[PDB]
């Protein structure tokens, strides 16, 4: 048959806003697809609604919620905004209708509201991911740059980790108002760092990395990682021919071929960088989740609720549940749930850098176990004569050029030490 | 009176509105942060004089003009104890803290052996944490006696 | 004068000019092209003009 689903959907001006984003674009592209490829769906098509929000919006944000809710759909869709996510997360708890979370900032740790899946890398993960690669690469001056307070919230586990492990780690914030991290710069060149923790969002990486060309830091001295999941989405050719080993995490997944195929059909589609966005890949998959566990659960009609009133629905419970366990392998990979919260745990990440062919894969970290990845001896022959030579004073057996020691012996080690040329000590004929 | 469950923004408005049909000259907010920030979406929404009871985490990306806090503001507290501790000339700082409220009053100590230095222990509390005894010799084994506390 | 704006291009894009790197330039013509992001990052860099 037909079924519907809430379309979650933030803007600046939300619905005054006449731009259309990107977002929409491969939720729409997503739709079309699964409404053409019969290898899963066995008789049923998807249909859904719009919603232009506008930022930092609850009542309007709650109308269009609970007017959608009346219209009757099976699933609703996470905001970009801190407070309309706590606004939808009320609604689909107070309101029971199954909720998936596509941009993840810290949730209460003692809220009753579970009736929800989050599709996001929990930074519990990428904290064990960056420790990790730390100890691998035997890292130990560290500092970290961010502008948002909400990741700074996220990172904390990080601000925490030399409980874990001893190592320093320099706090640096650059105000939205100026791209300019100038001073910063200034202040860890001269306090002699070449490592940085990198979190910021794209945008931002691109100005501080102009940043960084303006102030020329492009050496062998530096090592960095981008803990921020969107280089691939930037623009980064003019920058491997420095010779510095840029690292990252890629969640997305190009081994298989189909995955890259879906890449580039919405490049192609986008009508336009013009590269792959990680968020439209996740409300991708996370719509594909959705569908798949409609399609292997029984069949459920949706229910009308009230704006004004709670109303229960029997196949929420069960829908929910089944939600609990979904499982299926999306263009970002391996895709776990909890059975108790709906937060992402078990996903491998594509350890790639940056080198003068371009961006390539250095590894793979995985939840399990962490990260996976002269010359002419010249013939010194010598007579036993003390002290020159003498049989040295060792509880050990000796042998070859341990045999002996003494005034010349130890005069010729020092030569070789100064000419670097290694002796073989042979017996006087 | 208008009594509410933690973490509620369906009831909240639903009850908000409600006083708004009844009518007031001014709201008071909620105690929790998500109820209070929902809160604060109703008023903008609805010019009304909102008063926030609580510390909320303000994003400067959101246009907003109706919220009152009481609440000292979090940087005055770090400044304060900034002030504090360098009158005390304490050279060794342990931080202390059970949850990610706070992280404005942190930053800047995090920054003050930047500014004058001071040997500093960040230590986040398991949320969990009752019996806080093996944190605690831990931090025996770590000779740590002048301690800030962030605390409720 | 273009060849050495091409070089400097080029300087950033392998990334080995610095404050390190002391340069000097045969050219009398320095400010024909714009040099503003040269300016940063504290390379030493020297030259004439008439």
């Given at each position: 048959?037909v079924?519907?689903?809430g379309?979650i959907?933030e803007?600046?001006?939300?619905?005054?806003?006449?731009?259309?984003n990107?977002?929409e674009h491969?939720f729409?592209?997503?739709?079309n697809?699964i409404?053409?490829?019969r290898?899963l769906?066995?008789?049923?098509?998807?249909?859904?609604?719009?919603?232009?929000?506008?930022?930092?919006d609850?009542?309007?944000?709650?109308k269009k919620?609970?007017?959608?809710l009346?219209?009757?759909?099976?699933?609703?869709?996470?905001?970009?905004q801190?407070?309309?996510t706590n606004?939808?997360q009320?609604?689909?708890?107070?309101?029971?209708?199954?909720?998936?979370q596509?941009?993840?900032?810290?949730?209460?740790?003692?809220?009753k509201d579970?009736?929800y899946?989050?599709?996001y890398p929990d930074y519990?993960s990428l904290?064990?991911?960056?420790?990790?690669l730390?100890?691998?690469?035997k890292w130990r001056?560290?500092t970290?740059?961010?502008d948002?307070?909400?990741?700074?919230?996220r990172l904390?586990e990080?601000?925490m980790?030399?409980?874990?492990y001893n190592?320093?780690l320099?706090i640096r914030?650059?105000?939205?108002?100026?791209?300019?991290?100038?001073?910063?710069?200034?202040?860890?060149?001269?306090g002699?760092?070449?490592?940085?923790?990198?979190?910021c969002?794209?945008?931002?990486?691109?100005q501080?990395?102009?940043?960084a060309?303006a102030?020329?830091?492009?050496?062998?001295?530096?090592?960095?990682?981008?803990?921020?999941?969107d280089?691939?989405?930037?623009?980064?050719?003019?920058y491997?021919?420095?010779?510095v080993?840029?690292?990252?995490?890629?969640?997305l997944?190009?081994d298989?071929?189909?995955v890259?195929?879906?890449?580039?059909?919405w490049?192609?589609?986008r009508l336009?960088?013009?590269?792959?966005?990680?968020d439209?890949?996740?409300?991708y998959?996370?719509?594909?989740?959705?569908?798949?566990?409609?399609?292997r659960?029984p069949?459920?009609?949706?229910?009308?609720?009230?704006?004004?009133?709670?109303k229960?629905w029997?196949?929420g419970?069960?829908?929910m549940?089944?939600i609990k366990?979904?499982?299926?392998?999306?263009?970002?990979?391996?895709?776990?749930?909890?059975?108790t919260?709906?937060?992402?745990?078990d996903?491998?990440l594509?350890?790639?850098?940056?080198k003068?062919?371009?961006?390539?894969?250095?590894?793979?970290?995985?939840?399990?176990?962490?990260?996976n990845?002269?010359?002419r001896?010249?013939?010194?022959?010598?007579?036993?004569?003390?002290?020159?030579?003498?049989?040295?004073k060792?509880?050990?057996?000796?042998?070859g050029?341990d045999?002996?020691?003494?005034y010349?012996?130890?005069?010729?080690?020092?030569?070789?030490?100064?000419?670097g040329?290694?002796?073989?000590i042979?017996?006087?004929?």
């Amino acid at each position: 048959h037909v079924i519907r689903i809430g379309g979650i959907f933030e803007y600046a001006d939300g619905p005054n806003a006449q731009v259309m984003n990107a977002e929409e674009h491969a939720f729409r592209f997503s739709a079309n697809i699964i409404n053409r490829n019969r290898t899963l769906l066995p008789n049923t098509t998807l249909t859904y609604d719009i919603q232009r929000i506008h930022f930092h919006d609850s009542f309007e944000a709650t109308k269009k919620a609970c007017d959608q809710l009346a219209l009757g759909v099976v699933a609703i869709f996470g905001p970009s905004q801190g407070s309309t996510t706590n606004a939808v997360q009320s609604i689909c708890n107070a309101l029971e209708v199954p909720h998936i979370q596509l941009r993840w900032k810290h949730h209460p740790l003692d809220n009753k509201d579970t009736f929800y899946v989050n599709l996001y890398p929990d930074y519990a993960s990428l904290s064990h991911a960056i420790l990790d690669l730390v100890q691998s690469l035997k890292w130990r001056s560290a500092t970290v740059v961010y502008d948002d307070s909400t990741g700074l919230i996220r990172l904390q586990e990080l601000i925490m980790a030399p409980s874990r492990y001893n190592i320093r780690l320099k706090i640096r914030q650059l105000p939205i108002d100026s791209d300019d991290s100038r001073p910063l710069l200034k202040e860890m060149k001269r306090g002699r760092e070449f490592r940085i923790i990198f979190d910021c969002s794209h945008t931002m990486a691109a100005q501080i990395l102009k940043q960084a060309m303006a102030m020329g830091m492009m050496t062998e001295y530096y090592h960095f990682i981008f803990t921020t999941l969107d280089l691939y989405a930037l623009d980064l050719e003019p920058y491997r021919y420095s010779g510095v080993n840029l690292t990252g995490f890629r969640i997305l997944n190009v081994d298989n071929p189909h995955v890259s195929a879906i890449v580039e059909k919405w490049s192609m589609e986008r009508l336009q960088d013009g590269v792959m966005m990680t968020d439209a890949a996740l409300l991708y998959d996370a719509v594909h989740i959705v569908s798949v566990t409609y399609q292997r659960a029984p069949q459920m009609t949706v229910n009308s609720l009230q704006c004004h009133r709670h109303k229960a629905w029997r196949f929420g419970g069960r829908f929910m549940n089944f939600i609990k366990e979904a499982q299926w392998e999306g263009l970002t990979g391996r895709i776990v749930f909890n059975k108790t919260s709906g937060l992402r745990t078990d996903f491998d990440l594509d350890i790639i850098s940056l080198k003068e062919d371009g961006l390539e894969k250095v590894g793979v970290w995985s939840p399990a176990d962490g990260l996976n990845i002269t010359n002419r001896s010249l013939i010194v022959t010598t007579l036993l004569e003390e002290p020159f030579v003498m049989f040295r004073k060792s509880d050990r057996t000796l042998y070859g050029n341990d045999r002996f020691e003494g005034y010349c012996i130890d005069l010729l080690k020092e030569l070789a030490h100064i000419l670097g040329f290694s002796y073989e000590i042979r017996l006087v004929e």
